Amino acid sequence: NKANVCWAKALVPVLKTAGIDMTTEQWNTVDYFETDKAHSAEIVLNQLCVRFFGLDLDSGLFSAPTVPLSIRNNHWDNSPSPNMYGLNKEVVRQLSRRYPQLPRAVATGRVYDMNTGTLRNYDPRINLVPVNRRLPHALVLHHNEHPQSDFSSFVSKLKGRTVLVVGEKLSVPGKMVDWLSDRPEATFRARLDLGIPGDVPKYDIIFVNVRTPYKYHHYQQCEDHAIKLSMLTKKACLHLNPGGTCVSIGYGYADRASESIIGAIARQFAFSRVCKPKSSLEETEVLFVFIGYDRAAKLSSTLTNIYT
C-alpha cells in the first residue's frame, strides 16, 4: 500500500526544491535505503524534513504544489496527481520570524540546527524532534540497552485458537501457530516490507513480532517503525476472524504517521489498550492490544504514564 519501491528516486525532485542533493552516504542514513526495502516516500520526506529543518511536514514547509509523489504499479514516482510537494516560500517567510536563518537553510540544502539557530551540514543527530508538533504523549528521554523481550507468555494468555506470528519466530504453547517471515523456516515466506500477503488466511490472533532499533531518540525509533505498522499491523484487519485480536510491538505514536495509523486501527476494534509486560525491558517498547475486531464495546494518557 504505502510502501513501494523507488521512493528515494521519487524524492529527489522534491528535496531539490529545498536545495537538498543527497549523496549515497547520506541516503544510507535512511535504514531502508541501505537494506534496499520498499518504503513510503511521504514518511521518508517527513523524516528528512525533521532532520534538515527541525520541523515535520505539518509545518507546511513542503506544501507547495510543485512535484507529485504518486504511487503507480507498486512504485513511488512523480507522475501527475494531486499529491504534490515542494518548498513553500510563503511558509518559509512566516517561519523566518521565529527562525531567522531558516531561509538560508532551505535555499542551500543546509541543516537548520534548532538548538543554535545556525547552519550545519547534514548529520542525522542534529534535529531529533519536530519543534512544531504537539506530541500526543510523553517520550522516553533516557533509553538503555536491554536484552530482547520475549512475548511468548503474553500471547499464550490471549483468547483464541489460531495465531499468525508476523516477523521473528515466536512459539505459543497451547495454540496453533502459523509464521509469516522472510526466514527459510517460515510457514509463509515473504518479504515483510511488502506487507502481509493478501492470500494469507484469517486468524483468531495476529501477533506482530517486529522490532525497530533505537539509534538516536524515541522519536526516531517510532518514525522508523511507522512503515511496519502500516504494512503489517494495519493489514492484520484483513486477516482476522470476527471478534479477533491483533497485538503489535510498537513505540507509541511520537510521529504523525504512527498516530494516524494507530487511530485508524483502533476504530476497527471494540477495545484498544497499551500494555508493557514484565518481559518488556526496553523503555520505549510497548504492545498495542486490539481486542474485538468488527465489534463495539486514554491510549495517549497510558503511553504518557508508561514513558514519563
Residue numbers in the entry: 472 to 768, 775 to 785
From the primary publication:
The VEEV non-structural protein 2 (nsP2) is a cysteine protease (nsP2pro) that processes the polyprotein and thus it is a drug target for inhibitor discovery. The VEEV nsP2pro is a papain-like cysteine protease. The active enzyme consists of two subdomains; the N-terminal subdomain (which contains the active site residues C477 and H546) and the C-terminal SAM MTase subdomain that lacks enzymatic activity. The substrate binds in a cleft between the protease and the SAM MTase subdomains.
Here we report a high-resolution crystal structure of the VEEV nsP2pro, which contains the wild-type N475 residue at the N terminus and K741A/K767A surface entropy reduction mutations in the SAM Mtase domain distant from the active site. Surface entropy reduction mutations were introduced at residues K741 and K767 of the SAM MTase domain where the lysine residues were mutated to alanine. The goal of this modification was to obtain crystals that would diffract to high resolution for use in ligand soaking experiments and co-crystallization trials. The construct harboring the K741A/K767A mutations yielded crystals that diffracted to 1.46 A resolution. Inspection of the electron density maps revealed the presence of two conformations of the N-terminal oligopeptide residues prior to the catalytic C477. Electron density for the N-terminal residues was visible starting with K473 of the A’ (active, ~45% occupancy) conformer and N472 of the B’ (self-inhibited, ~55% occupancy) conformer. In the A’ (open) conformation, the N-terminal loop is exposed on the enzyme surface and the active site is accessible to substrate and ligands. In contrast, the B’ (closed) conformation reveals that the N-terminal residues 472AKANVC477 are flipped into the active site and to the interdomain cleft beneath the β-hairpin, thus acting as a pseudo-substrate. The B’ conformer of the K741A/K767A mutant nsP2pro construct used in our study was considered to be catalytically incompetent because the density for 472AKANVC477 is continuous and of high quality.
